[PDB]
Amino acid sequence: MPHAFKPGDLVFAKMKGYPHWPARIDDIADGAVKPPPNKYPIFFFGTHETAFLGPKDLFPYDKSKDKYGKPNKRKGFNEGLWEIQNNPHASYS
Numbered sequence: 001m002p003h004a005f006k007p008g009d010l011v012f013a014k015m016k017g018y019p020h021w022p023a024r025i026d027d028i029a030d031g032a033v034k035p036p037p038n039k040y041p042i043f044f045f046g047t048h049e050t051a052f053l054g055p056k057d058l059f060p061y062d063k064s065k066d067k068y069g070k071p072n073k074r075k076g077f078n079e080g081l082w083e084i085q086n087n088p089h090a091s092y093s
Contacts, residue, residue, distance in 0.1 A: 005040055010061035010088050012068040013042045013053055020059060020068040021077065022084035026050065046080025048092045 005011075005025050013023035026041040028034055035041050039052040059068065061084065069085075071078050083092070 005055060005058060008089060010084055011042075012059040012061060012064050013044065013051075014057040014059070015051065015053070019072055019074060019077070020064070022046065022061070022069070022080040024084070024088055025058075043092070044076075044080065045083040045088070045092075046076030046078070048076075 007025050007027040009025040011023050011025065012020040014020050022045040023042050024045070026043045028041055035052040039054050040058070042051050042053045042058070043049075044051070061069075069081060071081065083090070
């Protein structure tokens with residue numbers, strides 16, 4: 001049975017104008033900017049960008065990859081697919 005999201009969880013993350021995108025829930029480093037209430041820091045594989053999202057835009061990776069884990073023309077996406085599958089917990093900084 002599901003828990004709340006926690007750092008290290010793998011997801012597809014949805015933003016307006018973009019396909020559901022391979023991502024992870026990030027940690028927040030000591031002294032780093034914190035997310036608004038009820039939002040999570042989302043690290044997007046491939047683009048290596050961060051955005052703040054709530055659970056409605058977050059789809060667990062295992063359950064959703066059959067639907068969402070297929071190649072895409074968008075910049076960084078296929079790189080993203082490789083990272084989430086092959087080294088999702090690596091430092092990309």
